[PDB]
Symmetry: C3
Subunit: 201 residues, 3 copies
């Protein structure tokens, strides 16, 4: 009942930072190592980062890493890089969780899922995270996901299997914006499903 295994978080924006902070606080278990990959820096509009003391201009994943000082008994590594089909070498570990909103990320998300699964990682990603507050956050394997959701339809057409999707099913093309309470709820459910997948071994 000690930390075991490695989780890679691809995306450390408003959702991925929340999931990083949830995973870093797990005790009596959880991952022994967390890798967080994103090449973006803290901007004025990253209020959740700034309220925790991040400075404008800092890489988001360096701010995160800094919360794990010398005596921390799990390792947290911030990798300040944007993932393209050619730096997939940074993808490995036991669970790979991709958290970037929108449809502009789906080709890379699909490349990361394939690369991770062929190295034996379990994979998880989102199916829409928009919403004003009380929207149901649901969890589904890709083969049971609703084909009317364009993210599930695309991953199905790309032949993805054995892949967990989490979210509200509301997308950038729906009316709702992105709100902090919905991202807290998605991050809490993401964290639970990551732990279930880390139990796998």
């Amino acid at each position: 009942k000690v930390p075991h295994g490695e989780v890679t978080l691809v995306g450390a924006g408003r959702l991925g930072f929340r999931t990083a902070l949830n995973l870093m606080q797990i005790h009596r278990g959880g991952p022994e190592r967390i890798k967080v990959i994103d090449g973006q820096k803290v901007s004025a509009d990253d209020l959740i980062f700034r309220l925790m003391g991040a400075k404008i201009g800092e890489y988001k994943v360096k701010f995160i890493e800094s919360l794990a000082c010398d005596g921390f008994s799990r390792t947290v590594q911030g990798i300040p890089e944007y993932i393209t089909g050619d730096n997939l070498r940074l993808i490995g570990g036991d669970v790979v969780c991709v958290e970037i909103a929108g449809g502009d990320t789906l080709p890379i998300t699909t490349e990361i899922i394939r690369y991770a699964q062929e190295r034996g990682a379990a994979t998880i990603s989102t199916m829409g995270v928009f919403g004003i507050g009380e929207e149901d956050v649901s969890v589904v394997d890709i083969d049971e996901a609703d084909p009317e959701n364009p993210i599930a339809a695309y991953l199905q057409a790309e032949g993805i299997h054995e892949h967990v999707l989490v979210g509200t099913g509301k997308l950038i093309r729906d009316w709702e914006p992105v709100t902090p309470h919905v991202l807290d709820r998605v991050s809490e459910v993401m964290t639970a499903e990551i732990l279930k997948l880390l139990r796998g071994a």
Copy 2:
């Protein structure tokens, strides 16, 4: 999916500060301008402000405005005044949200609602925020409210219509105090309701 519209928050105490922080974190939507109006300063008992970096003696609205630096892509204006009949003219914009407490607040709430409706704003306020933690938070138009609630009964007797009320329906006369978990639930629901009224405009 960009910020649009103006919301005025009257009251920036334990509840209104949480609503302001929720709206300031909305992406891909939410208001373009937030005006927060309260005369009071941070005191030692305002622990939620102190835990987020506020200094005792700072006006509550100046602390909130200070989170919106020059690069922030919405405008947040802190007005360090209590609303009275003399400066009702500070109330403007598309949605006015009243979250005040302390002494006799129903008469000025009624005045703010009458004036904001004259100016064409949509209006929302609270119908009791007391509770020890798991009390249901409900949302009603005033003329559909549960007639046992004494805030709705007062505003109905003052001829208020077309007004949204959110709360637990526990009030100062009930035995329960004000707890932080109930305030977070109230502020999440108020935020979602504000977004619905901003759309409607």
Copy 3:
């Protein structure tokens, strides 16, 4: 509608610090005095403490007490000791809540309940706080608790009555770790239960 009564929190680790912070934030009621008793210092791994500005090496109860400065409307008495049979007289107040961190806590929890009851205090403790996110948190009197849970069975074997238990039912021996969202939910429910037991104080 002012603070009244005394709550003693035995344990100020990841769960007891959240319960202290909830009780410290209550407005228009709650306890007038909170006695927090723990002998432990903040370590690198106490991220929730460090994120709120605690320094490594500080006593957890003294960091907590430092939030209740001279202007604060309640007193917090941070007692930097562990409870043993030799210093049970430190337990006092109207409500005593045991949330002791580290495991192996049931013999001393039984002693604390017997002595608190002699003093006329109401008592509450946990029945398992492990969980990955959405586990039901339940509240039960010890004579109605399920004796298949080993904590309930032990305390029933030690002849404990008139004592509330709160938790998820998942223990150190189940697979699930301790996650921050489950500790938030357990502390929110414990805070509500403490305020019900405080009624009349």
